Design a protein around this nucleic acid. Structure first.
Ligand SMILES: [Mg+2]
Lengths: 389, 465
DNA sequence: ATCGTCAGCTGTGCAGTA
RNA sequence: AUACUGCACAGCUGACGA
């Protein structure tokens, strides 16, 4: 049924030629390439000046890049070699039945290597009485990384092996009392950031036999197991640094904020120099239009990870949430709540969490530095898309 | 400190020496890379009578005039040109009346009433394969069969995997098959979901399923490839291997799977699996020194059968590290045969570090950050061409760790892996995350686990996609 | 023999692309 | 299973000690 629309397009092109009057003529059945030959009459007294016409007719649909002012078309490099050897001008005519649209373009037959991708713009390329003499004329921004550098105390004590099992000291009332830095690994030596004579043996079962001294070389060791033990040391040091402020969620390996005798937030946030300080860290919610039925809570949390790189110990922070019931009593189920909270979020609502966690984590023992910054050459456009995400 | 790079989007090569970056637009104005000699591709249908009828209706409606979705993002929801004069494939799809098989209603009730889980799936697969074999043995042979699954069989079977068990027994046929649910071909019907009951499932609009299904049908029926990655000028000849791992069918063991890929002498591409199973060695996701050599020998033997000479470069991608032994075997085979240039890269989607920038939208697709010898590559995120970020939370980056026996720097490896993302013939999307060889390896190992002992394995990729 | 620390892989299911 | 992305759970591996 495409033969009928080709015939209709050819007849309409011939009619458009004959309306102003140029003596168009069709061709036979085995035509290949040129679809017609046209003359220039010039208001009677015709003159032998012919042009070749190739017709592209369509029924419906849209062009490739129809932007209400222009579109584009691509040639097949066989018709190009065909049309570039003619001894007489060539013209391509586009016809559309749906809106009765006529357009025309000229194939450049004077350059060297050919050029495809005709850019057909409307108005200026209308095949009507407006353009006839022209037709007869030729006859960096910046970003930051999630990691946080660390610096350690210059001395630490590696001696005074306890010769006691690691669980017994914990279940002894000395263990479940004051400072719980009674950490020994695989029955190994008791090494810690504070001396046992003032920290452990005061409140933890140990032996007063030695003073110990280290230049923190233990921080870097070729063996994987000692690096893992050092990571355990760093994790327990971080847990000791935040007594009575946050708690440990073991099933998610996270540090969650605690309701200190009151079940609302603390709003510490970050000073941000001239800016202010607000962060709704702890929040409760209701359901079924009643505040008595407490639904859940929204403790903020972050998963920490210690990594060794460039002979430095970096901390990787993964923000997340913890849901309990009533307060300081864990929820029996939060399967869809975390996913639903994660689903409605943004990248803008994640950088601020990292910044506020960094500002809380240092200042008000291990110091925490500032995250590194990187420079990006090509900027995101970000213009005209102020919606969605 | 932490020098960064931003790569441009790679361009795929279409037919008639034309190149673009959008598979939808590049097909609609230049045609496929390899043109079919002939006008007709024949399609056969197996299933219920209603599914056969609405499959015919869907084919006719898609061929006539179907159109896109919305006026926002015109480069992301394009209209389908139709299978008429200006079809993107320059060919036609027809269904013959003799290649249609109907499953009787007096047997689906027999499937549904059985109180055992394995047997019903087994006999439904037996019925489908029996009808397909009967069609294949005759003189009404199609080029690609469509298995339209009715809702009554879907409720019993979906609520042992069915797709793997069906595609494992359909390996001896001469044509590939395509599974279509009742939701895609015929509208106004919704399938209830799994254990989260009374929620059902949601699908795309009419103009995305059409593009994906028509591209898959053309590739499965004709055998020619629609598009390929454009080579640069001055590169060395190379061959790509991809290795994955997969558990047993019901027990606790771990086998390995591999896929191979290279470039043709003219204008083409070669993407195959293998013709043998790689047996078991325990429950660790790691190869041995004997199973790593044979894959390299097969990869090098496949190249010399086509180009009459060995390649100058071998590229290996893996998900589970190269400790000491697999690398030893690969290096031993590579220096044994002929090859000077080598690359061994471990990819992982398990790192926790991200990149946070000001604004609202996330970082651009193709951003690369160098952490010493490792590369953080973002093959996901915002795209200027689409006009937005197609996602919900945030991009998940890939961590690239090359082995200590490698030649190229990590930036060139990152560029090469970023280039090999849009060569997935299953989909026409632009937001792919994983490179093609590992995706092919996972797709092969998805169905290689339901093939019994002593059965046949096909190396054609049309039986896995 | 089960339980703690470290890091990692594969399998299954749901929501939404804007 | 027309597709891709994001998330949530369970299981299994190696290295280290009672
Ligand atoms: Mg598919």
């Amino acid at each position: 049924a495409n033969q009928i629309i080709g015939e209709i397009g050819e007849n309409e092109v011939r009619g458009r030629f004959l309306t102003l009057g140029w003596q168009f003529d069709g061709r036979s059945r085995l035509e290949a390439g040129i679809d017609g030959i046209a003359e220039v009459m010039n208001e009677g007294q015709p003159m032998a000046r012919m042009i070749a016409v190739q017709i592209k007719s369509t029924k419906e649909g849209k062009y490739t890049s129809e932007s209400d002012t222009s579109f584009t078309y691509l040639l097949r490099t066989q018709d190009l070699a065909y049309w570039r050897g003619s001894n007489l001008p060539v013209i391509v005519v586009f016809y559309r039945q749906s809106d009765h649209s006529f357009y025309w373009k000229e194939v450049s037959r004077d350059a060297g290597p050919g050029e495809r991708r005709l850019n057909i713009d409307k108005v200026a390329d209308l095949f009507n009485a407006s353009t006839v003499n022209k037709l007869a004329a030729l006859t960096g921004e910046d970003a930051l990384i999630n990691m946080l550098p660390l610096t350690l105390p210059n001395e630490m004590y590696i001696a005074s092996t306890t010769y006691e099992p690691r669980k017994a000291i914990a279940v002894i009332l000395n263990g479940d009392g004051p400072k719980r830095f009674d950490w020994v690994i695989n029955g190994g030596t008791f090494w810690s950031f504070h001396d046992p004579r003032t920290s452990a043996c005061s409140e933890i079962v140990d032996i007063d036999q030695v003073e110990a001294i280290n230049t923190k070389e233990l921080a870097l060791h070729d063996d994987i197991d000692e690096q893992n033990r050092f990571s355990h040391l760093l994790r327990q040091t971080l847990r000791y640094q935040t007594d009575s402020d946050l708690g440990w969620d073991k099933d998610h390996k996270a540090l969650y904020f605690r309701a200190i005798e009151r079940e609302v937030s603390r709003n510490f946030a970050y000073t941000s120099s001239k800016k202010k300080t607000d962060a709704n860290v702890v929040s409760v919610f209701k359901n079924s239009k009643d505040e008595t039925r407490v639904s859940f809570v929204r403790h903020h949390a972050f998963s920490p990870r210690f990594e060794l790189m460039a002979d430095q110990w970096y901390l990787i922070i993964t923000p997340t949430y913890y849901y309990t019931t009533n307060g300081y009593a864990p929820h029996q189920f939060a399967a869809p709540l975390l996913a639903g909270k994660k689903r409605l979020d943004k990248s803008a609502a994640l950088r601020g969490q990292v910044i506020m966690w960094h500002r809380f984590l240092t200042q008000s023992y291990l110091m925490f530095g500032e995250p590194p910054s990187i420079h990006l050459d090509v900027r995101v456009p970000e213009d005209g898309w102020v919606k969605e995400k | 400190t932490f020098e960064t790079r931003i790569f441009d989007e790679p361009e795929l090569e279409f037919g008639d020496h034309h190149h673009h970056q959008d598979p939808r637009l590049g097909l609609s104005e230049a045609g496929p890379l390899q043109t079919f000699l002939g006008d007709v591709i024949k399609i056969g249908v197996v299933g219920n009578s209603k599914t056969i009828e609405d499959t015919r209706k869907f084919i006719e409606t898609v061929s006539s005039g179907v159109e896109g979705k919305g006026e926002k993002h015109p480069n992301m929801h394009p209209p389908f040109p139709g299978l008429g004069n200006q079809s993107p494939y320059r060919c036609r799809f027809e269904i013959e009346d003799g290649a249609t098989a109907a499953l009787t209603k007096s047997k689906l009730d027999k499937i549904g009433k059985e109180p055992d889980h394995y047997r019903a799936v087994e006999m439904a697969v037996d019925e489908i394969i029996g009808e397909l074999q009967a069609m294949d043995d005759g003189g009404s042979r199609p080029d690609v069969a469509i298995i339209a699954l009715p809702v009554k069989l879907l409720e019993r079977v979906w609520n042992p995997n069915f797709r793997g068990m069906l595609k494992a027994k359909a390996m001896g046929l001469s044509f590939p098959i395509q599974i279509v649910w009742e939701d895609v071909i015929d509208d106004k019907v919704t399938i209830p979901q799994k254990v989260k009951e009374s929620s059902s499932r949601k699908i795309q609009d009419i103009a995305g399923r059409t593009w994906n299904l028509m591209t898959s049908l053309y590739y499965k029926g004709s055998g020619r490839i629609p598009w390929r990655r454009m080579p640069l000028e001055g590169e060395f000849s190379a061959c790509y291997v991809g290795i994955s791992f997969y558990r047993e069918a019901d027990g606790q063991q771990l086998f390995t799977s591999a896929a191979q890929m290279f470039d043709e002498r003219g204008r083409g591409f070669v993407l195959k699996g293998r013709r043998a199973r790689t047996e078991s060695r325990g429950r660790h996701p790691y190869m041995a020194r004997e199973d790593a050599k044979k894959i390299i020998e097969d990869v090098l033997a496949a190249y010399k059968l086509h180009h009459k000479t060995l390649p100058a470069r071998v590229f290996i991608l893996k998900t589970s590290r190269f400790k000491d032994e697999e690398a030893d075997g690969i290096i031993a085979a590579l220096d044994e045969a002929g090859t000077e240039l080598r690359d061994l890269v471990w990819v992982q989607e398990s790192y926790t570090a991200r990149i946070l920038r000001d604004g609202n939208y996330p970082v651009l697709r193709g951003t690369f950050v160098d952490l010493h010898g490792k590369g953080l590559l973002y093959t996901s995120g915002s795209m200027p061409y689409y006009g937005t970020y197609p996602g919900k939370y945030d991009p998940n980056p890939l961590l690239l760790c090359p082995h200590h026996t490698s030649e190229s720097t990590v930036a060139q490896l990152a560029e090469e892996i970023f280039s090999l993302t849009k060569v997935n013939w299953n989909s026409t999307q632009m937001n792919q995350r994983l490179p093609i060889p590992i995706r092919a390896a996972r797709k092969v190992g998805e169905v290689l686990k339901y093939v019994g002992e002593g059965e046949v394995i096909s190396a054609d990729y049309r039986k896995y996609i």
